[PDB]
Amino acid sequence: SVTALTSNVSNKRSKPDIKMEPSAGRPMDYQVSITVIEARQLVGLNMDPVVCVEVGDDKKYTSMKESTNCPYYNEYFVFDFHVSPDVMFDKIIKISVIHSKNLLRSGTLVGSFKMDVGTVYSQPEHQFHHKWAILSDPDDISAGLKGYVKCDVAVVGKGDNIKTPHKANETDEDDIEGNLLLPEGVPPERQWARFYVKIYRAEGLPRMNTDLVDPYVQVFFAGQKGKTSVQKSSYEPLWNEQVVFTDLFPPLCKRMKVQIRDSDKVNDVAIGTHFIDLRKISNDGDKGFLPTLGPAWVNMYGSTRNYTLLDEHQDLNEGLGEGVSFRARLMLGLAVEILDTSNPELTSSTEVQVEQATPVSESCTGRMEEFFLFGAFLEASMIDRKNGDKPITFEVTIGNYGNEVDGMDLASVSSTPPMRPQITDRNYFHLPYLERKPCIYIKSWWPDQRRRLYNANIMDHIADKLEEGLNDVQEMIKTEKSYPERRLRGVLEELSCGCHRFLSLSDKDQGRSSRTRLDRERLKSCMRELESMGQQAKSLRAQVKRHTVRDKLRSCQNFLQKLRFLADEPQHSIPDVFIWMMSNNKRIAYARVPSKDLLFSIVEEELGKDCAKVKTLFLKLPGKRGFGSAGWTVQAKLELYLWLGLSKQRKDFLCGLPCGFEEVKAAQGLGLHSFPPISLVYTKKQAFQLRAHMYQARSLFAADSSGLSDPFARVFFINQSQCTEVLNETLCPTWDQMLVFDNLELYGEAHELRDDPPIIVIEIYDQDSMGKADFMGRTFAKPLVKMADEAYCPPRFPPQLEYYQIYRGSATAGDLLAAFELLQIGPSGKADLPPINRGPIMPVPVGIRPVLSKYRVEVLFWGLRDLKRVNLAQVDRPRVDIECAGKGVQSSLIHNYKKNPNFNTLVKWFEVDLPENELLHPPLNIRVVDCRAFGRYTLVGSHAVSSLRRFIYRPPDRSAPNWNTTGEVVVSMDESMLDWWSKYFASIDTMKEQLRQHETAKIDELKVYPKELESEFDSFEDWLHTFNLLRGKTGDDEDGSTEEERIVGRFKGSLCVYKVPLPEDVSREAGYDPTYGMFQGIPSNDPINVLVRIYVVRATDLHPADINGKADPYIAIKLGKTDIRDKENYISKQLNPVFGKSFDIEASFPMESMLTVAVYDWDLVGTDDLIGETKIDLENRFYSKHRATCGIAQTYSIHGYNIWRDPMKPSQILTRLCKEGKVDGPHFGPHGRVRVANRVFTGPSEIEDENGQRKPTDEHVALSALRHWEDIPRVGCRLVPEHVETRPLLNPDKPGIEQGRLELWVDMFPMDMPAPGTPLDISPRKPKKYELRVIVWNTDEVVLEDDDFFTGEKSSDIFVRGWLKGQQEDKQDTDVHYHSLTGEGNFNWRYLFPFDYLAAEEKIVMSKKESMFSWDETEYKIPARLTLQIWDADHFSADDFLGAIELDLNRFPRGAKTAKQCTMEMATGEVDVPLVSIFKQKRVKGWWPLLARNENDEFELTGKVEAELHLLTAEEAEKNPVGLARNEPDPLE
């Protein structure tokens, strides 16, 4: 349907999202993982390439590969940072290839690739996978392609989740050009370009020497830097100097750091920093434009302008946080000229050149116009009392105008008169303005670029209305209001109407000649993009329905962020307005309002959102002091009227104020109606009464060491504060308290007071012993205003309770269920008000408090697991008190916790009045206490079940088609070296195909899960749930504890909440018994020994834990008392180990059920480092209805690779599942069929054993029934298949970032049942031994290297060098064919290359020490590549390299029949020669071209080699032996 709602349905407008901690400059743990896989087509002669990987300033190196232009590394690097996102995304990832690097000489560079971290982070999975970095010479614009480096680059923040692909076998002919390391839309060939950063002049610089300043401008771009000259002793410097960078276009480093700095001999320091975003000043595609900026001003912000010997906020001058003061304004320019690299006229140097720019006038930035800024401080409350009782001023400044202390007709009044604060409460002051509101007015002069601010105002007006609508949709989804899809269609209609309005509005004032090129280009880009946004919104409106509303709501966030991106004007016009609180002339706290928000326009859409309005500001501490413990308290709270505009437009600059004031003006302004006042004296005043219905809170912050709090809420309104009562030892208080703010005085008749009420600040505190209180959080509210003429009638009144999101810093700290109403005391006094019905404490009145219905809460008490020590004492007699809304039940005593942590009474219950609205249900508190002697109960831990919606019983859907249970439905269905790795790799390929299908048979398979097994079976919580007990104070979001180390135990059990008068037929269909209640089918609680068999397959992408960038992983398993540490079987120097292990641990379930599988880096000296660990919780797996004990294989077999692991046969599993589910069956008739309930399965009736005779069996059709157990009518359930799950490895020391992926699975077998056999042989495949024999027969047309000293005869002493594993382990040389005059050599020399080989990986396996000083042997896997080189032997100098070919033993070209048919096209990029594998044909003889790169970096034919490659196995080589060189057996001529 197309009908829609165009108005706000919910009350999200009354729940503001004010946060005192911004996201600007907040550091966060980041990790860049770069896997250098290989390189190809590297440009060099006999090069030993080393790939250097730099991220930021840290650089790491691969190992050196000898004499190859296509090296293979497969090396993993991890770079760790703790920086803000803007600093992080500006870091340069530089993947270089160098050679000849050693201990005192830096390497010669071959080629480099650059990008920044933000380009990788803007990818769909924050990563590139298997992409080729285009290397280029960074010092030569005329040089060509220097090679490619295949690599993975991934960026993760703390808490990000990446769908990382599994590393399968890489046996493919990979296309380099279709898989380049470039973002989408960047062309594969990138030109060179010059980035002219023209630096004209600066104004308004602060004091830096002690007292002049000597500024220069340093520009950073893509890792390069260049600076202008120093303009000594000038606050208005004039450079007219351009800094020219030579870099590739389009650049993958998309930000430029322009920074004015002061020149000192000792203390060269930053003044201000601006970042030019190249995304905002350019566009790609056909209708795009080159990056252009200016000539236009740019505003720089940073620390306070007063000079100190050391600066606390010097990081603000470097641009690392939000600037708290105006530093300077820099007149700026940017142009990009694409260089013609084929021209030999211009120089090919890439060095940063600082040249003289062409000077342009000041009138090019717009004519200077007079601007008038007016402020009216209506209210100044909530002032931090730690600043003292000294008098308080508020200084407003804009640029340097109004800065009478630090900055450098009408006289501007920039500060309020000083006024002593009065006490609101123990934490807060307020300034007693009352009727006398102090005012400020500032004259300033800025260039007239109001059109930029107007267009930004229209775009941000559309974005503001869009975000308000999407917040309305999200909130009314959360509160379950009817028809959320109708509101979203109205939001999209309103968005498309705003986008159409922008096109009609933004094309005014194009006749100004002061438009820059960027103004015209970004105007065209904004019109095009908002027209496409309007059409896309009209298209997305028709697709919004009931079931699709959440994903379309997600898709509208793209429109929102694109509007926020386009609304940011990169050419600054008017600097932001700063409001500073002062006492003893000390700058205490600041707010910063953008000047486009205050700008005045005739057009409503061009008008700023805060212009001519009373703006609620919250001042905050500058710099890092505004975060953490210091930034918790509200520094000040202002109701500041603000107006900015032209001085010609100030006729109506008082129109937004509340009416009923007299203007008191300065002495020079007497008798002038246009003169602004220095104060307003209000004569009208309206009496009001605020009712704070503080009913409840939930999920609050824990500010005591017991894990609880003593919360009371302090409600702030205007200058008054009132407290609720303190409720002890709870994180979900039911205060149930009405706070009445009597006879409030609202000065003046505020315009639209119903639609914009004054804000209410609610602060939660934990009461402590000595009168002090811990801050717990802060929410904001807006009251529902009743005017005097309004009736207190539905649907508006009485107000309903709603959840207000409490924030403690940036972290969420619970919800406050409250309602607020602001009732006007009318002409008839307080008799017009509604009546008011524990001492003087008033309850929340009827009609606002929730209507209560009776519920029964039944608790299953299953057990208590891993109860940690309290006060250094072991928990011995635990008891689980459960309390919900005052009522509750207590569990039976566990008389001895160690021998039996079971409850004697399984199911208890209690009755409690809960709200009829299930969204208003209070949380249920699980509390575990230890019963010491003499009634001394100490708290062990507590868990808060925040939502009971999961545990609410409703009668099940028996109208479902599965329940019908009647009518028959029929469901129908070399080799010897296959092992478990065959089915594993087949399942990996199948999982890859299913991941490709979700994005858009010879070998039996298992189910590889990309995540945990818990993620596919809702954590196995079908009947049994986990409730983590918590103790201790909740940690802060920076330098604090996470929730996991507050866990002091687990409570096992379930809940079942239902309304007390059940229907009798509903109760009987649920099978209600008096002993177990609603919990039917509960398994036995008795202890049972379980054999836990943990198969550890492999680990991928382990975090390095040694100084060499690798680790030595082994598996350490904890389960109960068993602590296996397999440090004898560590895999040395490997970050992607293949363990292939199994571990048998007998554990006493359900007590010893927390399984910890960890990976530890073995260290020779010192303790072994933890890499990561995972927790599996096998109890939920063991007792699940999903049968997560042993995985169910796809097919049944009794031999081979697909052998059935389970000691229970499929017929036994089917019989047990039918017996426990009370299903008739399994009825085996003939061996091919079985009937289970109404459903009939058919399949094969016979099974083959190891020797292949046939035997009739029921197991195939029983397994067919088990595979379709989900389709069973009564108790049908999806059984857990045979699987390999991928579990992330987590380190508590580096939280939030997954730093390994351990592929494993766990099989559990009860030991009262028959035991399983031996564990599966999942040990890694042994490499098949081979021997490659390479008979170098002859060489022809080898180039002549030597020149004779006497006659000048050209000759070569040709010998052939060959290896297969490497130069240092496998190299063999022929004897030298001395003095070849025509390039002909005769060798007949046989190489022998014995090697171990894995056929699936196509890798040669060898074991050798990494260095001569290394402790152990490391397993290496290289590609099978035979390298043949020709060399010239010299007696008195080094031998000279002549040419080489690298034959991949699976994909090398067929050798030519003669030497004349051998051409360069066999080895180069031509495809005309078919490829041949030596593992398939075993004998390839022919001629191959040997190539070398000349000084022009092109391949040339430097020789040909006749060779015979003969691949045999080792067993064939022993029975038919030959000798090395020409020796016996089988001698050569």
Ligand SMILES: CCCCCC(=O)OC[C@H](COP(=O)(O)OC[C@H](N)C(=O)O)OC(=O)CCCCC
């Ligand atoms: C003197 C030569 C110093 C050479 C440099 C250096 O500090 O080496 C530390 C080495 C190796 O320790 P790790 O691999 O854990 O450090 C690596 C770390 N986990 C990381 O990955 O950052 O330890 C010792 O020498 C024994 C210390 C304890 C002795 C009781």
Ligand SMILES: CCCCCC(=O)OC[C@H](COP(=O)(O)OC[C@H](N)C(=O)O)OC(=O)CCCCC
């Ligand atoms: C036993 C007495 C102390 C013996 C100390 C000793 O010599 O250890 C050998 C180590 C090398 O051993 P690994 O790198 O395999 O470290 C093993 C494992 N990967 C680990 O993490 O520790 O030598 C150096 O660190 C010096 C290199 C100098 C190069 C110039």
Ligand SMILES: [Ca+2]
């Ligand atoms: Ca200086």
Ligand SMILES: [Ca+2]
């Ligand atoms: Ca406390």
Ligand SMILES: [Ca+2]
């Ligand atoms: Ca306390």
Ligand SMILES: [Ca+2]
């Ligand atoms: Ca280590």
Ligand SMILES: [Ca+2]
């Ligand atoms: Ca180690």
Ligand SMILES: [Ca+2]
């Ligand atoms: Ca260590």
Ligand SMILES: [Ca+2]
């Ligand atoms: Ca020579």
Ligand SMILES: [Ca+2]
């Ligand atoms: Ca020679």
Ligand SMILES: [Ca+2]
């Ligand atoms: Ca030589």
